[PDB]
Ligand binder design. Sequence first.
Ligand SMILES: CC(=O)SCCNC(=O)CCNC(=O)[C@H](O)C(C)(C)COP(=O)(O)OP(=O)(O)OC[C@H]1O[C@@H](n2cnc3c(N)ncnc32)[C@H](O)[C@@H]1OP(=O)(O)O
Ligand SMILES: CC(C)(COP(=O)(O)OP(=O)(O)OC[C@H]1O[C@@H](n2cnc3c(N)ncnc32)[C@H](O)[C@@H]1OP(=O)(O)O)[C@@H](O)C(=O)NCCC(=O)NCCS
Lengths: 463, 463, 224, 229
Amino acid sequence: NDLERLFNPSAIAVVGASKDPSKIGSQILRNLLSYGFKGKVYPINPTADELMGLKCYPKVSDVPDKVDVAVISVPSDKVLGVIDDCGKAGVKFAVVITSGFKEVGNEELEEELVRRAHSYGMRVLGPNIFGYLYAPARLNATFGPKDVLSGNVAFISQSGALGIALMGYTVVENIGISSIVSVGNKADLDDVDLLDFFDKDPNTGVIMIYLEGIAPGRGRMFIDVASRVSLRKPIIVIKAGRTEVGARAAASHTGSIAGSVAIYESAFKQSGILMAKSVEDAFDWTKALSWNPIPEGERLIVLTNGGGAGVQSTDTFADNGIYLSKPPESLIQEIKKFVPPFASFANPIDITGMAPDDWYYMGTLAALKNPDVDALTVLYCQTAVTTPIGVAKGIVDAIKEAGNSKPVTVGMVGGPEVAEAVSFLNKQRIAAYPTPERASSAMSALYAYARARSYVMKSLAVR
Amino acid sequence: NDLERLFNPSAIAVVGASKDPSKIGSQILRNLLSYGFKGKVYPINPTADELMGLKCYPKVSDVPDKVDVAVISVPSDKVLGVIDDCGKAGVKFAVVITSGFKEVGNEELEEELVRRAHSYGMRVLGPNIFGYLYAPARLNATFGPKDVLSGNVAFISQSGALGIALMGYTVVENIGISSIVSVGNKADLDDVDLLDFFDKDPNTGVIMIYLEGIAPGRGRMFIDVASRVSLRKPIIVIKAGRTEVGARAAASHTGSIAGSVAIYESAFKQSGILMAKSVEDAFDWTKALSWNPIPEGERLIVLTNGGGAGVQSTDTFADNGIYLSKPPESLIQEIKKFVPPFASFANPIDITGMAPDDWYYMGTLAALKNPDVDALTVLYCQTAVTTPIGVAKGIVDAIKEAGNSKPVTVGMVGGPEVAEAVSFLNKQRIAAYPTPERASSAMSALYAYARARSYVMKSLAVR
Amino acid sequence: SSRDLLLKAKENGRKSLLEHEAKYFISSYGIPVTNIRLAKSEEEAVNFSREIGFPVVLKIVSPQVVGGVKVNLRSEEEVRKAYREIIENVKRNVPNAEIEGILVQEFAPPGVELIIGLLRDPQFGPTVMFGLGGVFVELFRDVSFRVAPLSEQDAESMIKEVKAYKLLTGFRGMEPVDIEAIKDALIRAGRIGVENEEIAEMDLNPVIAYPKGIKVVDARIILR
Amino acid sequence: SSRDLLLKAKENGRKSLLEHEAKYFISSYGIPVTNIRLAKSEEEAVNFSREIGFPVVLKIVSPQVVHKSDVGGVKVNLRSEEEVRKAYREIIENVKRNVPNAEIEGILVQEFAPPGVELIIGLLRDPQFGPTVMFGLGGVFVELFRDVSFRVAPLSEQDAESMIKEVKAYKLLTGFRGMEPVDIEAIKDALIRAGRIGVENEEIAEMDLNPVIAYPKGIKVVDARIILR
Ligand SMILES: CC(=O)SCCNC(=O)CCNC(=O)[C@H](O)C(C)(C)COP(=O)(O)OP(=O)(O)OC[C@H]1O[C@@H](n2cnc3c(N)ncnc32)[C@H](O)[C@@H]1OP(=O)(O)O
Ligand SMILES: CC(C)(COP(=O)(O)OP(=O)(O)OC[C@H]1O[C@@H](n2cnc3c(N)ncnc32)[C@H](O)[C@@H]1OP(=O)(O)O)[C@@H](O)C(=O)NCCC(=O)NCCS
């Protein structure tokens, strides 16, 4: 079933808005308007005639318009009533904020909600969610932050509080968002339906999912869909319940049985999915995949001032099954024009600690231009000889003057000035990090996805 | 082998200072005065009459004083000359900045440097180092940042550029430093000699080491000393060369043969040492160990709003061999007075996402006061219902009002307002982190050290 | 018509296949098995033992169910001793059962033992499991999983996943085994699960791997 | 003392201890070994086998032939005094033809060792940390998978116990199909004494206790290799 009208609705209704601006229904209404929804918004309230300067209606079906989406923010004992009115009004999607369903043991009520919805040809998101956001439609139907950075990352969250928090965290980590979707209890619409939409969506290039579990009998379809998506768009899953003890903890908070850990891991491999063990990993990888093409080969080059950062990088890469190889002679000789003879060209390429700013420019440029180099990680350790910002600008210039598009991550270590340089680089969608390991972990994700894509390609090879 | 006069010298000489403020010798000299050394400083230069407003001398032996330490910043072909003069002047410690020794193949020269020094009863730090710093003596004999935050952390670095950079990084991560020591080539003084000093030093409470390798026949002594220190002070080692390929890379940059990876890992275990695989881990742990006592029991309590963060935390703790247990009934009952009945008390204790600011105070207070609780990790996910700073202040108040000292880590997830709250907490030496996994990893380091200390105690038990 | 075996079983209230019916079934899917026939007496058995080739081993085949196994019957005249002894052994040790007969089983040379499993995961449906036999699954739990249907890529990689993989690539007193035959078996195992909804789980244990080809020695098929 | 074996060897240019000398040595440190005696004739061989108990294994003890199994200088499972004489002469017959001028110190009589869980205990000298004890389960688990643990000597009881639990094959010691749990305390004991040997005897470059068999009570070293320097 097509979700075009959910993400790009002509008209949306907010049921549960109130004169009280504190209530959740009103918070949603405020986000819609502030984020700049260009369609029609119809507040629904039993008493008010006007909310937020918009004509309010007692019921959705009293609205003289075709309402595509209805955000339901009323207590659980009132939800079924609204569903019928919505069904009568021919609304196609009910976005149910309301809690008090399967997660608290009342599974009977949830199954009824979905049943009555379907009888009207209506689909249900949630329930027990914080809404959803779609940047390409200037649509913020959540009670989270009023804003996000625009970009190509879709985030699907099965967690409420964490999801709504991570929504705000994306700004701090400079991640561009195309969509935020709280899926909650997944009583009806789930990750498979959404993956199908984001597969087609030219605005979404990366998909990140916080996943606690999928519905029984849904896993096979999940692999078929995810697997085809992985061919063109990387999927990162933050698995809640990677351990036996954690699986049971997630099962409780969710209100469902815990599936097999080992089998979930296999399904992710068969789908070409990258599994992250932590929020930081997910966001670090996401940032790199969102801003870079896949490496076309294994000729990875590490560039550093001093061996310390290089060795940390070499260890990190090796932990991810990536092993550096001797660099092209054409590159070495290009660098040997300014670098002292005693320096190391074993890869990582050490240009010595006392190296000035322009050496980062020349070395980064030489590396990218060279046709035998597929990818580049640049590591910088702050010293009195350099300026962190001058190094960052040298790297920016070398990217633009290379006149190409090769994957590149940056790791910068130092004081307050380095924090600024790193921020500066990320503002220009260049994956930069405050440690060499994290920069090496980011680059490793690019290679992990390449190899994951290759896995699926071989898996679909025709007999 | 007494290093009291190295870290707490009455008089220090800087050989290699110049009228040219750009040269390294001058950068060192500038740091000594800026950091506020209260002792006597003696610039040494063949011609100058006064550097930095200080009477300069052509050579150390011409100084009308007993010089404890000499920082040597002259080319390698002049170092031996200066050593002889220092020896004549009865200098106890030669701190040799100069490069161009064993790391570039000139091992003969290095062994000669040490030999001639020893003949005068003089000790050598380095060579090939960026100097050292000791906060309790207001002594900054480096050409790195002019300042650091004061605290109880000693940092020993075998890497030059990474070490000097990490020195600056400590400020960003709000780590209080007692000492920075560049050991470089370890031609003479090494980690064993330094561990002996920091063992006795009442200013140092945590010791962090960037370690590429140990000298042949030195490892046995290393375990005896390190294990003994681990009994009272935690030691974190960032091992460069945790992999075969990385070991070789570290070996090159160092100019020495690579030792066995598995055997280093064993030695660290026998020494009660925490091995970090990354800079972020090391600093995250260091921060927690520096600001907290070790837990006296396994009664760890996680406090969270919404299961999402709780499950990430449960997974991380389990990955580190820590498993949460049912909380004390007294605690559940104390919390159940404001928390809804449906909430989860399985540990993590979920107080629901829509929990207001005050609930973090009440819950953190109740947890710390309860005599059956040994340690506490508080997780927070930003929502419109709370204020990140109000939550942080609630936690500060509860710690102060609990009137005790139990280990505590905080994990906060959200936008810019969370970034400030986290900074605020670390500013008050409360270990706070921007993700639940990192906060859970920090707390795991406290327990890892407890168990590491217990390991050494049992190995030293009298049969 | 291979499905006749599952239908006749469901008809007779049985929730699993007898040892021989289970092998016939997986053999119809192209998974190599040790050759067998089920004895309806001693006379049928000895001739059956005469029929499939020597030496031959005897077991017990009854939906009910210890000391019901023999070894190395060399001669057609000799065979007579062991059958009676089993039916002599069973009654003294255990009184009641409908005995479909005694299995006349082909001898299997020693080799590298394997485990191939089929289970139904609630989320992902039919899933194939792999691992090396002996202590490596029973004790260490060194197994890999793939959700069916299996591609050749899935089969190849799940084999290399296990930590005991090197036991397939040659070691002390043991030459490398036919990995292609294993891959083939794993894919057909997955096919059995996808196609037969009435199979709840399947255990191929032990499966022996040789330099060329493999042999399922015992097969367990549970119904639902 | 025990060091006489190490000294006489250094004197005779040898860089290792003969199989029997290696066992006498580790036995003097309290590491239980498979019982053995050195036969100087046909007559002595019979009385020792009578003394050690049947069955018995025989080997040639000579510094020249490095491997005894394929030269034809080993006879397994000799149950009777008649069997040993047969096997005794066959060895002295195989030996002369395969090597005429080897120096035969005698024939070794080995106690049969019941089957059990095979172990490996090693002693190596690391450049950084000096004498180090290695542990791991025998067979494929070390030769193939390389599943070993290390501890730097001297070993405490704590070191010994934890390095045993460190290995991934540990569960082969806690009982499994057709095998009762084995004496972990005896293993700990042996590991500590192995480390002591390394610390005290600088002239030992490496030591391999392989195979070591572990029983529900006690253990027995079946073969020991001590390399010198
Ligand atoms: C960050 C996270 O934790 S996300 C997790 C997922 N979501 C949650 O946790 C939500 C938790 N809260 C709930 O589930 C609640 O039941 C909510 C938010 C749905 C409703 O709470 P409230 O706002 O207090 O409900 P309330 O009863 O006040 O109804 C809201 C408004 O809708 C109105 N309303 C009630 N019934 C109807 C109806 N049939 N049609 C239209 N409006 C209606 C009410 O009158 C009220 O407006 P008013 O102020 O004019 O009277
Ligand atoms: C030590 C090092 C910095 C010296 O380089 P430099 O500053 O250019 O050396 P110079 O030749 O200019 O000597 C420095 C000053 O000491 C003076 N000097 C030389 N020999 C001297 C002596 N025996 N006694 C006193 N002063 C002496 C020089 O005259 C000069 O002073 P000036 O400018 O007034 O003439 C350099 O050899 C080096 O090793 N650099 C790398 C350091 C490094 O990377 N360390 C590792 C941590 S990252």
